[PDB]
Amino acid sequence: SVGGLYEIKIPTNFTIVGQEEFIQTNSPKVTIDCSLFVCSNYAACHDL
Amino acid sequence: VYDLSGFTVKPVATVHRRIPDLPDCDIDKWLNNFNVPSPLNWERKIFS
Ligand SMILES: *[C@@H]1O[C@H](CO)[C@@H](O)[C@H](O)[C@H]1NC(C)=O
């Protein structure tokens, strides 16, 4: 401080800037038929 | 809402394909040959 005053940069002109932000709120609802995935249609696999 | 067990469309018919007119292997004629070799000189025949 000089004489109790400080040097500061104060804006003399301005613009508006736009910044986008994607926030994920959902995701693909994946479903699995465990029986069809593990064994297809083979009765020998479905029994086990 | 209930997702049921996955069904598969069942076969309407069957397809069977093989090379026609192939000769008999005659495996019995070679196995029944009376000139039987010993384990020391085991004989081999390839059937194709
Ligand atoms: C602010 O900036 C714009 C673009 O350079 C200019 O047209 C405008 O005259 C400026 N205003 C001042 C007060 O400097």
Curated annotation (Swiss-Prot), chain B:
Superkingdom to which the source organism belongs: Viruses
Function description: Attaches the virion to the cell membrane by interacting with host receptor, initiating the infection.
Official protein name in the record: Spike protein S1
Organism this protein belongs to: Human coronavirus HKU1 (isolate N1)
Name of the gene: S
Complete-protein stretch covered: 303 to 350 of 1356
